[PDB]
Design a binder for this molecule. Structure first.
Ligand SMILES: N#CCC(=O)NC1CCCCC1
Ligand SMILES: [Cl-]
Ligand SMILES: [Cl-]
Length: 182
């Protein structure tokens, strides 16, 4: 009902259409990416510096660290939105790695539509210190996008890219895309 064909538009990049959205996966350093939103997979205190979260907070800078700790004390948050600091983005959305991944990605998509944003870049949420299994994480990320498209919610969002630290985890995402393709 929604899925296009898997292909490689550039060396090390794999893509398929999901309704009006281009979904892409690649391995590399997410802190070098440019997008309207970059997602950080962190702890329930929004102050983890282990796995990909270490690089994201180091590169974003101390003003972003302070935004995180101020919001964390204000109320009980499932996720928080901060400035981009010294990353190449308009906002960082910090999600909890241990939470349900489909729910976290659904929230990111909704928040990006609220800001009229077009591009998102995320890591393999939950596969760091939270130790969720990579095939369950790939299934959840792609399911969230399918549901968002099915409900007619994609208007401003046009591109969702997963940049993945470990090549072995990229292989799991690519196999999940091939399972779904038209
Ligand atoms: N987000 C996310 C995924 C993440 O942090 N992954 C770790 C796995 C161990 C090596 C360093 C990167
Ligand atoms: Cl994690
Ligand atoms: Cl990752």
């Amino acid at each position: 009902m929604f899925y296009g064909t898997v292909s490689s538009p550039d060396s090390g990049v794999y893509e398929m259409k999901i309704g009006s959205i281009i979904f892409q996966v690649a391995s590399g350093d997410i802190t070098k990416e440019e997008a309207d939103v970059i997602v950080n997979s962190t702890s329930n205190s929004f102050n983890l510096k282990a796995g990909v979260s270490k690089a994201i907070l180091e590169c974003a800078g101390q003003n972003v660290e302070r935004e995180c700790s101020q919001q964390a004390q204000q109320r009980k948050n499932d996720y928080i939105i901060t400035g981009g600091g010294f990353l190449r983005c308009k906002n960082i959305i910090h999600v909890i790695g241990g939470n349900d991944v489909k729910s976290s990605v659904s929230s990111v998509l909704q928040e990006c539509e609220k800001k009229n944003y077009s591009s998102i870049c995320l890591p393999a949420i939950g596969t760091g210190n939270a130790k969720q299994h990579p095939d369950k994480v790939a299934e959840a990320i792609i399911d969230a996008i399918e549901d968002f498209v099915q409900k007619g919610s994609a208007q401003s969002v046009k591109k969702v890219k997963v940049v993945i630290f470990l090549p072995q985890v990229l292989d799991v995402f690519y196999a999940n895309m091939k399972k779904r393709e038209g």
